[PDB]
Every structure is written in C-alpha cells, then in structure tokens.
Amino acid sequence: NYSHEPNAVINLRVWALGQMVWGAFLAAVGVVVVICLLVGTYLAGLLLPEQSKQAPSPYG
Amino acid sequence: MSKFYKIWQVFDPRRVFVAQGVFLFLLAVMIHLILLSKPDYNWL
Amino acid sequence: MSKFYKIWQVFDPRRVFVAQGVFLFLLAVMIHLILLSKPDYNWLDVGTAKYGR
Amino acid sequence: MSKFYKIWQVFDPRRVFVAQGVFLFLLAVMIHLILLSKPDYNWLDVGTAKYGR
Amino acid sequence: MSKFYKIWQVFDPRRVFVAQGVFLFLLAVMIHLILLSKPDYNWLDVGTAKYGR
Amino acid sequence: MSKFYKIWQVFDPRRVFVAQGVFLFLLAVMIHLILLSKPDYNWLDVGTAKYGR
Amino acid sequence: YKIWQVFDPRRVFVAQGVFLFLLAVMIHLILLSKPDYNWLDVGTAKYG
Amino acid sequence: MVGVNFFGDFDLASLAIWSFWGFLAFLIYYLQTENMREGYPLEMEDGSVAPNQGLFPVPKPKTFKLPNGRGEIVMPSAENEAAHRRNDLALARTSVSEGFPHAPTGNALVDGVGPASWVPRRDEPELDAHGHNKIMPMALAKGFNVTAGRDPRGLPVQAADLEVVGRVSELWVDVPEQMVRYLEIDLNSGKKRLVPMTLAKIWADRVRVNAIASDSFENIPATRSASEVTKLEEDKISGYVAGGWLYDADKRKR
Amino acid sequence: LSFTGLSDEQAQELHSVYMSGLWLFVTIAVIAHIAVYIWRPWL
Amino acid sequence: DLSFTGLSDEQAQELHSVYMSGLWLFVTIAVIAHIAVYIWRPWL
Amino acid sequence: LSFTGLSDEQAQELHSVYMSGLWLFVTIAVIAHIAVYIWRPWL
Amino acid sequence: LSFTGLSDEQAQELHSVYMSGLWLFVTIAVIAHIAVYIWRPWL
Amino acid sequence: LSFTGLSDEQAQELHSVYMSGLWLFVTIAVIAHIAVYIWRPWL
Amino acid sequence: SDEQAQELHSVYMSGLWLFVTIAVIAHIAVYIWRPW
Amino acid sequence: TGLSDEQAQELHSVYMSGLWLFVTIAVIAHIAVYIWRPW
Numbered sequence: 001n002y003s004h005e006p007n008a009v010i011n012l013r014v015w016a017l018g019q020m021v022w023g024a025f026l027a028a029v030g031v032v033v034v035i036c037l038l039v040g041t042y043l044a045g046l047l048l049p050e051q052s053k054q055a056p057s058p059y060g
Numbered sequence: 061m062s063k064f065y066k067i068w069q070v071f072d073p074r075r076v077f078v079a080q081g082v083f084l085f086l087l088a089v090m091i092h093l094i095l096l097s098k099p100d101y102n103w104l
Numbered sequence: 105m106s107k108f109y110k111i112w113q114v115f116d117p118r119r120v121f122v123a124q125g126v127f128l129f130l131l132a133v134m135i136h137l138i139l140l141s142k143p144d145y146n147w148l149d150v151g152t153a154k155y156g157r
Numbered sequence: 158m159s160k161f162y163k164i165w166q167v168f169d170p171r172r173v174f175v176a177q178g179v180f181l182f183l184l185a186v187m188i189h190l191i192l193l194s195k196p197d198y199n200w201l202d203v204g205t206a207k208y209g210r
Numbered sequence: 211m212s213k214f215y216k217i218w219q220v221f222d223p224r225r226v227f228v229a230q231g232v233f234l235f236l237l238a239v240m241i242h243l244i245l246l247s248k249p250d251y252n253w254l255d256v257g258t259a260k261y262g263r
Numbered sequence: 264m265s266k267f268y269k270i271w272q273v274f275d276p277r278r279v280f281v282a283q284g285v286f287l288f289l290l291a292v293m294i295h296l297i298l299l300s301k302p303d304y305n306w307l308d309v310g311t312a313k314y315g316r
Numbered sequence: 317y318k319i320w321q322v323f324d325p326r327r328v329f330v331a332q333g334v335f336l337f338l339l340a341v342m343i344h345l346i347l348l349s350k351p352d353y354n355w356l357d358v359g360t361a362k363y364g
Numbered sequence: 365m366v367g368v369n370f371f372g373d374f375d376l377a378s379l380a381i382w383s384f385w386g387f388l389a390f391l392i393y394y395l396q397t398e399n400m401r402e403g404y405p406l407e408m409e410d411g412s413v414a415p416n417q418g419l420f421p422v423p424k425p426k427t428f429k430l431p432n433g434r435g436e437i438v439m440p441s442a443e444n445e446a447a448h449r450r451n452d453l454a455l456a457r458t459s460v461s462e463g464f465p466h467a468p469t470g471n472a473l474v475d476g477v478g479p480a481s482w483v484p485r486r487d488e489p490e491l492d493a494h495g496h497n498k499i500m501p502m503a504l505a506k507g508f509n510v511t512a513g514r515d516p517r518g519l520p521v522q523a524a525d526l527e528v529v530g531r532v533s534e535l536w537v538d539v540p541e542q543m544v545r546y547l548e549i550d551l552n553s554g555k556k557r558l559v560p561m562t563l564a565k566i567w568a569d570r571v572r573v574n575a576i577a578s579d580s581f582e583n584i585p586a587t588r589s590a591s592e593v594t595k596l597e598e599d600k601i602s603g604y605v606a607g608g609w610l611y612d613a614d615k616r617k618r
Numbered sequence: 619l620s621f622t623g624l625s626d627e628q629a630q631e632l633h634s635v636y637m638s639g640l641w642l643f644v645t646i647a648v649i650a651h652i653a654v655y656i657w658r659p660w661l
Numbered sequence: 662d663l664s665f666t667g668l669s670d671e672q673a674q675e676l677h678s679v680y681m682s683g684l685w686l687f688v689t690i691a692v693i694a695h696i697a698v699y700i701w702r703p704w705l
Numbered sequence: 706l707s708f709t710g711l712s713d714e715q716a717q718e719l720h721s722v723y724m725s726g727l728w729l730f731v732t733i734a735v736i737a738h739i740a741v742y743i744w745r746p747w748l
Numbered sequence: 749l750s751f752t753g754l755s756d757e758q759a760q761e762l763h764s765v766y767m768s769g770l771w772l773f774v775t776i777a778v779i780a781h782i783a784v785y786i787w788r789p790w791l
Numbered sequence: 792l793s794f795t796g797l798s799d800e801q802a803q804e805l806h807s808v809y810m811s812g813l814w815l816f817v818t819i820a821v822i823a824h825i826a827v828y829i830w831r832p833w834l
Numbered sequence: 835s836d837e838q839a840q841e842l843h844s845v846y847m848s849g850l851w852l853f854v855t856i857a858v859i860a861h862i863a864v865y866i867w868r869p870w
Numbered sequence: 871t872g873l874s875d876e877q878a879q880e881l882h883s884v885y886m887s888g889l890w891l892f893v894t895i896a897v898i899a900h901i902a903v904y905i906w907r908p909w
C-alpha cells in the first residue's frame with residue numbers, strides 16, 4: 001500500500017535514478033578499495049627504516 | 061534529432077543506466093584528481 | 105552517396121555503436137592529452153600564468 | 158578495370174571494411190605523429206612561434 | 211607466358227590477394243623508411259631546407 | 264634434362280612455388296643490402312655525389 | 317511542451333522576452349561605460 | 365672472428381640472429397598449421413563453409429594407428445569432423461547478423477548445449493594397454509583399497525539447493541592411474557547415477573555438489589552397463605553436471 | 619526493428635525521463651562551471 | 662535484396678537518417694568549439 | 706563463381722557505393738594536402 | 749586439372765582482372781618514379 | 792612414380808608454364824645485370 | 835491540446851535558435867575585433 | 871483569437887511587408903551615417 005506511486009513517469013524516474021546510483025556506488029567502492037590499498041602501502045612504508053627512502057636511483 | 065528514442069530499442073536501458081552511472085562517476089574522479097594535482101587548482 | 109544507407113545492410117548497429125563510442129572517446133582523450141603535453145595549449149597552466157596565479 | 162566489383166565475389170565486405178578502417182586510422186595516426194615529431198611541421202609549435210607564444 | 215592464368219588453377223585467390231597486399235604494403239614502408247633514414251632523400255628535411263624554414 | 268617435369272611428380276607445386284617465392288624475395292633483399300652497405304654501390308650516395316645534392 | 321499547458325503561452329513568452337531584453341541592455345551599458353568596449357569611443361579615436 | 369664483418373656491420377652474430385628469425389618464421393608456420401587438424405574447415409552460423417578459411421592453409425593428413433584394434437584415425441578428415449558433429453541442436457539465432465549468440469530453445473542441460481554441451485565420442489570405452497576397461501567400479505578392480513583420505517561411500521550427497529538426494533555407493537577408478545574419476549549415487553528415486561569426482565567436494569560429513577540442484581540429479585544420463593562407462597556417456601554426464609554452474613544458479617544457495 | 623523488446627511508446631517515455639535528468643545534469647554542471655570560473659578561471 | 666543484417670532498404674534509410682542527424686549535431690558542436698579555440702589560441 | 710555468395714549485380718551495386726565513398730575520401734584528402742602545400746610545402 | 753577446382757574460363761577471367769589491376773599499379777608507380785627522377789634523381 | 796599424383800601430361804604442361812616464367816625472370820635479370828655492369832662494373 | 839503545444843514549441847524553439855545563431859555570429863565578430 | 875491559418879498567413883505576410891520596409895530604410899540610414907561618421 002505504501003510505496004505505491006500512481007504515476008507512470010515518477011515510477012520510471014525513481015527506477016532509473018536507482019540504476020545510475022547503483023553503478024556510481026560500484027565505481028566508488030572500487031576507487032575506495034584502490035585508495036585504501038595504495039595508502040596502506042605508503043603507511044606501512046612509513047614503518048620502514050630510513051634507508052628505504054635513501055636508495056640510489058637506477059635512472060629509470 | 062527527434063527519433064533518438066530509438067536507441068532504447070538497440071540497448072537494454074537498465075544496463076545503460078548503470079554504465080552511465082559508472083562512466084560519469086569515474087570521469088568526475090578523473091578530473092578532480094587532475095585538478096587536485098595542480099597547486100593552482102587544488103583547494104585542500 | 106545516395107546509397108550509403110546500405111552500410112546497415114552490412115553491419116549491425118550494436119557493434120558499430122560500441123565501436124563508435126569507444127573510438128571517439130579514445131580519440132578525444134588522446135588529443136586532450138596531446139595538448140596538455142605541451143607547455144603551451146595547456147589551458148590549465150596558461151590560465152595559471154595569465155592571471156598570475 | 159571493368160570487373161573490379163568481382164572482388165566482392167572473393168572477399169567478404171564485413172572483413173574488408175573493418176580491415177581498411179583500421180588500416181586507414183593507424184596510417185593517419187602514424188603520419189600525423191611523424192609530422193608532430195618533425196618540428197618544422199609540428200603545427201602546434203609552429204602556431205606557437207608564428208603567433209609569438 | 212600465355213598460360214599464366216593457371217596459377218589460379220593452382221592457388222587460391224583469397225590467400226594470394228591478402229598475402230601480396232601485405233607484401234606490397236610492407237615493401238612500400240621499408241622503402242620509404244630507407245629514404246627517410248638518408249638525409250638526401252628525406253623529402254621533409256629537404257623541404258624545410260629548400261623553403262628556408 | 265627433358266624429364267625435369269617429373270619433379271612435379273615428387274613435389275606439390277603449391278609448396279614449391281611458395282618456397283621459391285620466399286627464397287627469391289629474401290635473396291634479393293639480402294643482395295640489395297649487401298650493396299647498400301658498400302659505399303661504392305649505394306646508388307643513393309652515388310647519386311648525391313654525381314648530382315651535387 | 318509541458319510548460320505550454322502550465323502557463324498561458326503569453327505568460328512565459330512575455331516574461332522571457334522582457335528578461336532577455338533587460339539582459340541585453342545591461343550588457344551593452346556595461347560595455348559602453350568602460351572606455352574599452354565603448355563602441356562610440358574606439359571608432360572616433362581610430363578615425364581621428 | 366672478432367671484428368670480422370663480411371659486409372657492412374654484418375658478422376656471424378648478425379647472420380645467426382637473422383637465420384633465427386627465418387627459422388622462427390617457418391616454425392610459427394609449422395605450429396599454427398599443426399593446430400588445424402581439428403576444427404577446420406571454418407563454418408558460418410548457418411553450418412555452411414565460409415570464405416575466410418584463415419591465412420594459414422590446413423595441412424596434409426596424417427594417421428593415428430590405434431591400440432586394441434580400434435582402427436585408423438585420419439586428421440584432418442571429413443569422417444573425424446562428421447562423427448563428432450552434433451545435430452538436432454536446440455538453438456535459436458538471436459540475430460540475422462553473425463557474431464551474436466544463439467539461445468537455448470528448451471532445457472539446455474538436457475538439450476546438450478552451452479556449458480552443458482557434449483560431443484559424440486565413440487560408444488566404446490577407454491582402454492588400457494592390455495585392453496581392459498580403464499574405469500572399473502572399485503569392486504571389480506581386484507586389489508583396490510582406499511589407501512588414504514576420506515572414504516566417501518555412504519555419505520549423503522548435498523546439492524546446490526542445499527537439499528539432499530541420496531547416498532554414495534561405489535567409486536569408479538582409473539586403474540592404470542590409481543585414482544578416482546567418478547563416484548556413484550544411490551538416489552532417493554531408486555536410481556543410480558554417476559557424478560565426476562572433480563565436481564564433488566568430500567566433506568567430513570557429506571559430499572557437496574554445488575554445480576546442480578536437486579531437480580537435475582534425476583534427469584542425468586544413465587549408463588547402459590553398470591560395470592563399464594564409455595567416453596560418450598562420460599561426456600554427456602560431465603557436460604550435464606558442469607552446465608549447472610550457469611543453468612541452475614537461480615537455485616544455488618549459500 | 620526492436621532488438622531489446624521495447625516499442626516506440628515505451629522508448630519515447632524512457633527518453634523523456636532520461637533527457638529530463640540530462641538537462642538537470644547540464645544545468646547543475648554549467649552552474650558549477652560558472653562558479654569555478656569565478657574562483658579559479660582557466661581562460 | 663542483399664542484407665547481411667536483415668534490414669531492408671526502408672529500415673536502413675530510417676536508421677541512416679537518424680544516425681546522420683546525430684553525426685551532424687556532433688560535428689556542429691565540434692566546429693563551434695574549434696572556432697572558439699581558434700579565437701582564443703590559433704594553431705595555424 | 707563467387708566465394709562469398711554474391712552475384713554480379715549485387716557486386717556491381719556494392720562497388721558503385723564503395724567507389725562513391727572512396728572518391729569522397731580522396732576528395733577531402735586532396736583538398737587537405739592542397740591546403741597544406743599552400744601552408745607549408747614539403748616539396 | 750585444378751588443385752582448387754577452377755575451370756579454365758573462370759581462371760582466364762580472374763587473370764584478366766588481376767593483370768589489369770597490376771598494370772594500373774605499375775602505371776601509377778611509373779608516373780611517380782618519373783616525377784621523382786625529375787625532382788631528385790638517383791642514377 | 793607419382794608421389795604427388797600427377798600424370799605426365801599435367802606435369803609436362805606445368806613445367807612448360809614454369810619454364811616460361813623462369814626464363815622470363817632470367818631475361819629481366821640479365822637485362823638489369825647488363826645495365827649495372829655498364830653503370831658500375833664489379834669484375 | 836498536447837499536439838498543439840508541441841507544434842508551437844517547435845516554432846518558439848526554431849526562431850529562438852535562429853536568434854542564438856545570430857548571437858554566436860555576433861560574439862565571434864566581437865572577439866575578432868577585440869579579445870577578452 | 872484563433873482567426874484562420876489563412877488569415878494568420880495573410881496579415882503575417884503584410885506584417886513582413888512592413889518589417890522589411892522598416893529594415894531597408896534603417897539600413898540605408900546606417901550606411902549613410904557610416905559614410906558620414908564611422909564607428
């Protein structure tokens with residue numbers, strides 16, 4: 001009974017928005033996981049001795 | 061210009077809407093990260 | 105030229121359109137990056153200098 | 158020169174079309190990049206120089 | 211010399227067409243490249259030299 | 264000497280023509296390059312000098 | 317074409333027209349006020 | 365032979381690398397032609413023969429002389445492809461264009477299409493050198509005993525819908541290899557049916573088959589013999605079971 | 619033609635709503651682009 | 662007659678007309694933007 | 706003879722159309738190489 | 749005889765068209781080699 | 792006799808056409824060699 | 835009258851777009867004369 | 871007002887015959903004053 005939208009257009013509009021936002025939520029999840037990955041990497045690197053950030057370059 | 065509605069006869073609209081959500085969010089982060097890189101355009 | 109429409113008697117709209125989207129977006133990104141590669145034609149840094157920012 | 162259309166009694170137009178499309182696009186890209194690497198034809202650097210930027 | 215139309219009774223037109231097309235194209239490229247790699251046949255360097263650019 | 268058409272009764276003419284074609288092209292390229300190496304037979308350097316280009 | 321059902325065609329056409337005219341006037345005045353972009357000022361000096 | 369250029373900068377090293385390029389070309393030819401003994405000539409979706417038959421030509425037929433007097437097999441050949449050719453295919457074109465799927469018209473696990481497809485291998489079983497059948501039930505395999513691991517026999521068989529369907533009865537083994545290929549089920553419906561060991565995960569209390577649900581365990585192809593199993597029946601069974609990872613997924617739980 | 623199962627009417631409806639949202643998007647985006655030209659111009 | 666796709670000349674002309682509409686719109690936008698970029702920063 | 710299933714007439718029509726497209730391509734290319742030779746000769 | 753199952757007439761036809769294409773190719777190549785020779789000889 | 796299954800009649804015609812092409816090749820090659828010995832001899 | 839509303843919508847948008855074409859032409863023209 | 875599709879074309883054509891005259895006179899004037907004083 002509740003949740004009943006009489007109008008055809010409003011029903012279509014709330015559906016399409018749901019679909020679009022679902023996709024954007026997937027993308028955000030992916031971006032966030034990548035971000036956590038790289039950032040945790042950097043941080044764990046901060047736990048390392050100072051000679052890690054001193055190393056000579058290979059020029060390449 | 062008025063017969064563009066015929067695209068939904070070609071592509072399922074459910075998947076197209078999900079895909080647009082993805083594409084647009086990713087484009088947004090792309091540009092925000094492009095702008096964030098530049099000190100002149102970074103706001104943080 | 106009168107009969108270019110027969111292209112869709114050869115190809116299917118679905119695959120053609122996937123191709124078109126991919127190719128055009130790829131090309132756009134490519135050219136934008138080409139420009140951003142030049143210290144000129146890089147709208148961002150140009151505006152940065154113009155307005156002394 | 159009067160029976161070239163017989164080529165389509167040999168090759169399938171789908172494949173031929175896709176092939177030559179790829180071929181032309183890559184050819185064009187390579188020629189453009191060639192010029193772009195020769196600074197006397199790099200339209201971007203030129204226009205920079207001609208217009209004093 | 212008059213019977214050479216029998217290479218079509220021995221070979222298949224499709225494979226020969228594609229193969230010799232590849233062959234001609236790669237040959238053309240190799241030759242243009244050999245020229246370009248020589249300053250006296252690089253039409254581009256020669257042009258920028260001739261027009262005083 | 265006259266019976267040499269019987270080698271076509273030992274070999275598939277298809278195989279043989281393909282193999283001869285390949286051998287010939289590669290031999291030719293090899294030789295033309297052995298020439299482009301020697302400065303005296305690089306007809307391009309020769310032309311440059313002859314024509315004062 | 318929903319707007320036409322919502323308002324007398326006259327109501328949105330007259331409003332939009334007046335708004336646009338006002339915007340044009342304002343832009344022009346802003347350009348004339350500035351010595352640069354004063355169409356009258358640049359031409360006289362150039363001819364003189 | 366240092367600093368010895370035959371012409372230009374070309375020395376033994378250059379000659380060798382170029383000779384290698386040539387040998388390699390011939391070798392790619394050889395291999396991509398020997399990978400043509402099965403599958404060619406190329407077809408359309410209509411079952412016809414297409415114009416593009418590849419840029420590499422199909423090679424000249426060889427011959428496999430089989431053990432146990434099973435005959436001579438010639439690849440590439442028309443007999444080879446026509447035997448393993450499926451017909452009466454429950455499929456419907458999705459479009460007149462090519463490069464689009466073909467939907468299963470009916471029940472696919474049965475109609476033998478898609479991941480559930482099978483191939484008409486010959487209804488003669490697989491043999492060892494001695495000519496005895498390869499797959500025997502562990503009871504006919506004299507001397508065969510469980511040397512380790514969890515003896516599944518008698519364990520219930522949980523399925524993809526988490527429901528139970530029967531109890532394991534016997535183990536079908538690769539005697540020359542000494543390993544378990546198929547396991548048999550005493551189903552509730554009073555029937556015996558095989559299921560590949562690679563598709564069944566022996567737990568401590570049970571055997572789990574997440575491939576298919578319960579409605580399917582009954583319509584599994586059977587064996588005309590209870591002591592042997594042919595290659596054909598093996599393909600039918602294995603395809604049927606493996607197709608459940610796609611065609612019974614609306615039923616799979618957990 | 620109808621590859622996806624939809625008719626001209628359903629497609630008209632769906633396109634109407636899609637372009638509604640599209641024009642909303644472009645409106646918001648041109649607003650934000652204007653404000654940014656206000657903050658950090660780029661031309 | 663010949664159709665590797667199923668579409669007869671009728672559906673083909675229809676689809677082509679709409680596709681070309683979209684193409685000319687795309688091209689109009691690109692032409693406008695190119696003229697602009699020329700004004701702001703010429704490249705010839 | 707036809708390795709693809711065409712007849713001479715289907716082929717002839719296809720070829721007229723392919724030729725139209727090719728000549729259009731070549732036309733634009735000629736226009737452009739001309740404009741170039743006018744703008745920065747390479748010969 | 750045929751290793752591909754063509755008849756003398758289809759083959760005579762194929763060869764006619766192939767030779768025509770080849771001669772067009774060579775003609776254009778000759779135009780070009782001549783132009784090049786006039787502009788910058790090599791022999 | 793026939794490893795490749797060609798009767799003498801067909802083999803002979805094939806060698807006819809083969810030798811014709813061969814001698815054409817050798818002829819063009821001889822002409823080029825003549826020209827090149829005259830332009831820069833190597834013996 | 836939905837049909838009548840789209841009919842005139844077309845006219846409105848048609849003439850308004852012609853004015854927009856005129857305005858863009860005018861902007862290109864000013865930019866040529868003086869830049870900003 | 872409704873009027874007629876014909877009547878609307880009728881007076882709209884007469885309205886144009888006046889608008890054009892107006893524009894012509896105006897442009898002649900603009901040219902003449904461009905001659906005398908350019909801007």
Ligand code: BCL
Nearest residue numbers: 064067091124125128129132147687690691692694695698
């Ligand atoms: C000097 C450089 C100038 C500049 C020079 C130009 C010029 C010149 C041009 C561009 C063009 C573009 N510029 Mg710009 N541009 C600049 C700065 C930017 C920046 C930036 C952040 O810096 C961005 C993001 C953009 C953005 C863009 C794109 C919006 C646009 C190319 C569209 C495209 O790729 O179509 C290709 C994309 C596709 C085909 C696929 C899109 C995917 C969609 C979303 C999915 C399909 C939906 C579905 C089918 C729905 C059906 C309904 C339909 C609506 C009918 N520009 C700078 C300032 N720009 C080009 C343009 O707009 O061309 C028209 C153009 O001509």
Ligand SMILES: COC(C)(C)C/C=C/C(C)=C/C=C/C(C)=C/C=C/C(C)=C/C=C/C=C(C)/C=C/C=C(\C)CC/C=C(/C)CCC=C(C)C
Nearest residue numbers: 264265266267268269270271272273274792793794795802
């Ligand atoms: C380090 O040492 C260095 C490298 C310096 C020097 C080394 C030198 C050495 C090792 C030299 C070795 C030389 C040798 C072993 C030479 C051998 C040469 C031979 C065996 C040559 C034979 C040639 C034969 C030919 C060309 C025959 C051609 C025949 C035909 C064209 C006809 C075709 C034949 C047949 C039967 C067709 C008829 C078929 C039917 C069915 C009737």
Ligand SMILES: COC(C)(C)C/C=C/C(C)=C/C=C/C(C)=C/C=C/C(C)=C/C=C/C=C(C)/C=C/C=C(\C)CC/C=C(\C)CCC=C(C)C
Nearest residue numbers: 108110111113114238239242243663719722723726727730
């Ligand atoms: C080192 O190398 C460099 C690059 C420096 C120098 C060398 C460069 C080289 C080697 C360049 C070579 C270039 C070549 C070979 C270019 C060839 C170009 C060709 C052949 C282009 C052809 C274009 C044709 C086009 C665009 C045709 C379009 C046709 C259509 C749109 C219509 C399609 C057909 C239809 C609709 C008919 C269908 C009908 C029915 C009944 C189904």
Ligand SMILES: COC(C)(C)C/C=C/C(C)=C/C=C/C(C)=C/C=C/C(C)=C/C=C/C=C(C)/C=C/C=C(\C)CC/C=C(\C)CCC=C(C)C
Nearest residue numbers: 161163164166167291292295296706762765766769770773
């Ligand atoms: C280091 O090496 C360098 C490069 C410096 C020096 C050496 C260079 C070398 C080794 C060069 C060698 C060049 C060679 C061997 C070139 C050979 C070229 C040939 C054979 C070219 C042939 C071209 C043929 C063409 C373009 C044919 C075109 C045909 C058509 C368009 C007709 C279409 C045919 C149809 C429709 C068939 C009819 C079918 C039916 C069913 C009736």
Ligand SMILES: COC(C)(C)C/C=C/C(C)=C/C=C/C(C)=C/C=C/C(C)=C/C=C/C=C(C)/C=C/C=C(\C)CC/C=C(\C)CCC=C(C)C
Nearest residue numbers: 214216217219220293294749801804805808809812813816
């Ligand atoms: C250090 O290395 C260098 C390169 C410096 C020194 C060189 C060393 C060596 C070892 C060089 C070797 C050279 C050799 C062995 C050259 C050989 C050349 C030959 C054998 C050339 C043969 C050419 C033959 C041709 C072009 C034949 C063409 C035939 C046809 C076009 C027709 C064939 C038949 C057909 C189409 C019809 C079939 C008939 C029916 C009835 C179906």
Ligand SMILES: COC(C)(C)C/C=C/C(C)=C/C=C/C(C)=C/C=C/C(C)=C/C=C/C=C(C)/C=C/C=C(\C)CC/C=C(\C)CCC=C(C)C
Nearest residue numbers: 064066067070117185186189190619676679680683684687
């Ligand atoms: C590296 O070198 C650089 C990049 C510097 C230089 C070189 C650049 C190059 C080579 C660039 C090349 C660019 C090219 C080739 C661009 C081509 C662009 C084209 C062909 C664009 C076409 C666009 C068409 C569009 C956007 C069409 C859109 C259509 C619609 C949205 C509506 C269609 C509706 C349909 C089909 C409904 C009816 C359907 C049914 C089933 C009834």
Ligand SMILES: COC(C)(C)C\C=C/C(C)=C/C=C/C(C)=C/C=C/C(C)=C/C=C/C=C(C)/C=C/C=C(\C)CC/C=C(\C)CCC=C(C)C
Nearest residue numbers: 121122124125661690694696697698700701861862865866
């Ligand atoms: C304005 O006048 C002047 C030039 C005098 C001003 C002076 C200086 C200035 C400010 C110059 C301007 C520089 C600027 C801002 C240049 C760039 C302007 C641009 C890029 C305008 C372009 C806007 C384009 C957009 C937003 C792109 C629209 C295109 C799409 C969204 C593509 C989407 C395509 C689809 C959905 C078709 C997909 C079809 C299939 C079959 C998949």
Ligand SMILES: COC(C)(C)C\C=C/C(C)=C/C=C/C(C)=C/C=C/C(C)=C/C=C\C=C(C)\C=C/C=C(\C)CC/C=C(\C)CCC=C(C)C
Nearest residue numbers: 337340341342344877880881884885886887888889890892
């Ligand atoms: C500084 O500049 C700023 C920025 C302030 C503004 C710049 C420029 C502007 C604002 C430009 C404006 C341009 C406009 C408004 C152009 C058009 C103007 C018009 C239409 C003016 C007004 C009236 C024109 C008329 C009435 C012309 C001719 C009409 C007739 C002859 C129709 C008479 C009808 C009859 C006799 C109907 C009898 C018959 C029947 C069947 C009813």
Ligand SMILES: COC(C)(C)C\C=C/C(C)=C/C=C\C(C)=C\C=C\C(C)=C\C=C\C=C(C)\C=C\C=C(/C)CC/C=C(\C)CCC=C(C)C
Nearest residue numbers: 888891892895896897898899900901902903904905906907
């Ligand atoms: C330096 O050069 C020298 C001086 C030596 C050479 C000589 C001459 C030069 C250079 C002259 C330069 C400029 C001149 C002479 C400019 C003159 C401008 C004029 C006369 C402009 C405008 C005249 C406008 C008129 C007469 C407008 C009349 C408008 C009406 C009668 C209204 C018509 C419309 C009506 C009644 C309908 C209204 C309807 C409704 C519904 C409102």
